[PDB]
Design a protein around this ligand. Sequence first.
Ligand SMILES: [Cl-]
Ligand SMILES: [Cl-]
Ligand SMILES: [Cl-]
Ligand SMILES: [Cl-]
Ligand SMILES: [Cl-]
Ligand SMILES: [Cl-]
Lengths: 235, 235, 235, 235, 235, 235
Amino acid sequence: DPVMVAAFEGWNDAGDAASTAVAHLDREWKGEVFAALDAEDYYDFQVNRPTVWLDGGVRKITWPTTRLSVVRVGGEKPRDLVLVRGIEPSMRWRSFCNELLAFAHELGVELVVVLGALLGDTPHTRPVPVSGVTSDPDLARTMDLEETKYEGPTGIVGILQEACTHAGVPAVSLWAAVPHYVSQPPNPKATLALLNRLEDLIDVRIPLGELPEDARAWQVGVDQLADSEVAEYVQ
Amino acid sequence: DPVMVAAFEGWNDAGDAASTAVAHLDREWKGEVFAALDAEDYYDFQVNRPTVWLDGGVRKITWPTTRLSVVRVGGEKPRDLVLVRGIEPSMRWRSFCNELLAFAHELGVELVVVLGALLGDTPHTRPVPVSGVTSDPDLARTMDLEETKYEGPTGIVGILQEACTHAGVPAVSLWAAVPHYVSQPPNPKATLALLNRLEDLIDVRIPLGELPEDARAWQVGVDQLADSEVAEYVQ
Amino acid sequence: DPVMVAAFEGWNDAGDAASTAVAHLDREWKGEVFAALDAEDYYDFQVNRPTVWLDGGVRKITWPTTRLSVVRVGGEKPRDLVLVRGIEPSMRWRSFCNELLAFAHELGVELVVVLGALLGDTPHTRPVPVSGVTSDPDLARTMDLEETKYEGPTGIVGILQEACTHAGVPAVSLWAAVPHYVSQPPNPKATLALLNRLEDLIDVRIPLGELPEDARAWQVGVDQLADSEVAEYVQ
Amino acid sequence: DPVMVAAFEGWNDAGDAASTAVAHLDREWKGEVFAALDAEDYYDFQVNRPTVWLDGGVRKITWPTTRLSVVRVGGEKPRDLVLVRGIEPSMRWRSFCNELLAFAHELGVELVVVLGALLGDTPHTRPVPVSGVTSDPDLARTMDLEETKYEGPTGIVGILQEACTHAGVPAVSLWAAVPHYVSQPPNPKATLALLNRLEDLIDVRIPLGELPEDARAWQVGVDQLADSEVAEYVQ
Amino acid sequence: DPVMVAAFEGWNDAGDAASTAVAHLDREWKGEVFAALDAEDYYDFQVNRPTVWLDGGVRKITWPTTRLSVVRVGGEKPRDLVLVRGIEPSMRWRSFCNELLAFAHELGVELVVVLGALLGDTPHTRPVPVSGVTSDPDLARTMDLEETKYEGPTGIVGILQEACTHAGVPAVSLWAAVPHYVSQPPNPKATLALLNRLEDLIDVRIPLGELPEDARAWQVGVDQLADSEVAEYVQ
Amino acid sequence: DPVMVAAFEGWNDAGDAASTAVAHLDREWKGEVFAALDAEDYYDFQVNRPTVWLDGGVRKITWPTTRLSVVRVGGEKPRDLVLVRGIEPSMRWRSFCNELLAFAHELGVELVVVLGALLGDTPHTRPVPVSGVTSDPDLARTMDLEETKYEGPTGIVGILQEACTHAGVPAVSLWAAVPHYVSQPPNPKATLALLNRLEDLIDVRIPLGELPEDARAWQVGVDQLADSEVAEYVQ
Ligand SMILES: [Cl-]
Ligand SMILES: [Cl-]
Ligand SMILES: [Cl-]
Ligand SMILES: [Cl-]
Ligand SMILES: [Cl-]
Ligand SMILES: [Cl-]
């Protein structure tokens, strides 16, 4: 059955870890685009300024949006994945989510996985925690999803995962916790943590390309910053 | 390059000839759906009453809409077609058309063909006229498209084909003329006329299934209605 | 717990039987209005022309709409009912229904009953059939709801009752069948049939005012039309 | 001060009398267009099918809409008039009217006159009745506006004239009654009746061009239809 | 006659003084909710992030919105109040205000009072100034409303109070000035100042619960912060 | 032929240089307003707070918007200009631009010039650079428009100028570079630079009123600030 894997830039995307995880799937598997949501309905353009680029001689415009593409995995046991690469919208989240659920429906998506990253309290000197959230009582058993204590502000990931369950489409979101003292956008170690966890859930071989090297580089890069509150945040 | 073939039920669809032509492509080539336009924006539901059907025990609802699917043709020289099967909307035609053009854009559609049928003044005792309309000066040469005298009310086919040219996406619509004295929805002869003409334009083998038989049946069926204004409309 | 009883003029309202049933509840129980849906979003005004009336000297305008009021029943065992009196909208039915469901939610409505009438094949010489429709498996048992064979075009009643179950709000619609040979808008006998059936479902004493007389009058009125296909439609 | 004169095709426009009155002003005074309302918001396009015309070689599309132009009258005592030429919209009348009132406001319009025609009970053998409607208590005195008994369905003219008074912009609509037995769209006699009455209200010389001849022609044309219920409708 | 009392969190709500005043009315009088405005139309959700809470085991979502409830006061001389508790919207203020005015209309609201707080130049060592704003010339006399010099940026309170007068619904807003050097959200003294002034206007006994104590506590709390520009801002 | 000159406050308007250039045209030529875009569709009102002013006694509200007026220039060789004075919208830029293009179309605008200012790296001790941007290959020759290297975030000016070319309406935007170390809103020198360049493009005498003096004042004003990185930014 087809699975939708989504990720959104901005507030639910602590090191761009989640957004680059899906980018990575789209790239490695050469994903074929078939839909972009109409930015006009969702995006404040002063907050999300569109950009101009030059193609041959000519000026062209890129809008913020959420784009849908299909990848064809994988083994002798083949499969379609529906990737959703978006910026978190600034308005009409209920419609936004309905729009994705319509695609999910037309495509017969059987499971929605959403990826995110937040800033947490774990050192770089140690592996990245990934935790799930689901309101599907079935999936809660069917994987080991530890639990959810969380009460507070939520984002489009939270909203989308809830829209799914109200729709009766099984969904789970995976969260990676990124060391808050080192939060700058290139974070290969946490991207990798997400991708590994997704693989166990979906049961799909993911090609990790240059990522395992990148993450090691990052760590033996950060380690050079020698002030050690990481000692404090380990005991 | 990918081609979009569209057709709309109602006023531009004289014997359901055009709408069944695309249905036929979708069926024969086992087309895979990936998007439906949001009916909420386009359809007056008293004019286009949605229906209820029973699936196993359970009630389910079908809305009027315009649905998009992909077919993979064909030879050792393969190709993707994007089929659009719609009801003509009752409102916001400019947005409707923009919505299809966005899909066309994301998918890299290089040519849009729209199919239609109108009631004309040709006998059943004779082959079905199919004529093109284009505002692409190139295509006008590149095929033989005889000409357009037409001035008058237009439909979503007309509008869509014009939205394309303003967008700089080459488009043509093919029209079949259906004998007005015999206009009842099963019209295999004209469906076939459209499909033949499309094949010459797109250069794609179309499997005609039971259609060539159906059309012959229809004619040797109508012929039994023996009042002969068809004699009058031949000289 | 609060119950919402809704009814819509037009296609689901064969003798205005259903719409006058709710009018009757609103009148007899002196229902207090608190909301009208914004007509601007739902109604084609050429199909539903608004009217002008004179209040004292002054011109005033009535729009088609769907209005919500509260009634306080009843015994030493009191209760609130939420009445919905609408015209069937011509557009955006999904939003329309969401709008009613939001009110239902804010008000803590525990059950939605929708009333309708259709033209059927029962004589005036015999009692009016009322049948239910529900997709709540619970209510299906909890009342005796015979069954649903129906597949075909549906209306806002059908849609609303389905929107409820998808929302997880128990809903049922009650249908009365009105003799098609006598379909003219004053139909007290069928209004009464609905009101009786509602009373059994909700367990609420409904004051029937002048209705029981009216219905008898109607029958001893129609009976004078003495051509007897009613004999044919009884055996 | 600038005056807005509006007229709408369809239900408030019995012989196209009102719509051609404004057309006549636009033509004779060579009115300069500056705005069309966005059809997309107001018009059902199956009811108001847009048309295609040929300009030089090229196909071009005309949408139903409501267009605004400025005329510069007149004497040594000059004046601007704002003409509104529309089709009655099928939806969002409240917004439609607000949109016109915004233009009225930006332009500093001090008075809105709306023209209409209905089918009445006066013979062709006699002059055309024109009656006003206003809810401005001032104008009611300031002209002789006989009175308004009318209660019933209204149109966009009625709505617009009421939107004005709620907005505190003085407005009046003038109605001509067109003999119902002769209702076919060319009606120069009633167009002329409107134009005459407008002239008295606005105090503006209107050039009547070929109209006074046309109306005489029409009458000495209808008179030839010699069945005389006009005798009946005079006593 | 029914009175609407509204208050909005954010920019017009200096110590949450105004928003807690209405909360207090809703709580003390056990107000019954009947409507929330559709957040989807008004709220940027990155600015107003919705929250997730746990109910029993289950995740549930709270959106920013403006909610309407009814309270039944009071004496042997009873009364209904309509409370409006909102966040100031970030968009479509004209529609927002129309939406509240529609409720006001359906409910027959005769007067709208809006509460607000701003940061002013009065010491904590002295009572809180409350001033009114009205464009109802009647109310201006009917209460003593000192005057309005104010010209500058306005908020939804300002807009709403103006929308009312244009609608011909009498409205006044009451403003409390909160010492700018002590602006942190718990401000019982100013909440109390609003409630007292409202009581004089509406002529309704308001139960002040723990507030009179709270305000005294606050003052004998702030007084401990002993730098005395309050001496400077008194002479 | 009529020319549209537009300018937008905010991000594309470095010293309010561009916005005051158009203000200056509107003032000097006594431009007559005929349309404002509906703020409701485009503006976040917390970011663009509307203001209240007093007219005689009475409170009145000004919304952020984009307003259109006509000026009649000029010589024995007369001309109409359409001025557009706006704030950059925060949402629906595609519609915003379509709305302006509709006016352009109704008015028969043949060329659109958009004015802007950015912060650049030129000293106050030297003339203000103005550079053009166009995607009209014709205009690129027809004026000397040096070239465009620019790739990056764009604004409504960029978007509008691109919407024009896609629409087949020739458009160019003129940019002035304002010394970043002196960016405070009164910048007469750069306003003047824009106006001069516009004059050469449009071939229209622009009355500069007090501006040439103002700019000199500004420079002999800034020069007094005597830290000299301007020496550094000249070599
Ligand atoms: Cl979450
Ligand atoms: Cl056509
Ligand atoms: Cl049904
Ligand atoms: Cl009327
Ligand atoms: Cl204010
Ligand atoms: Cl740019």
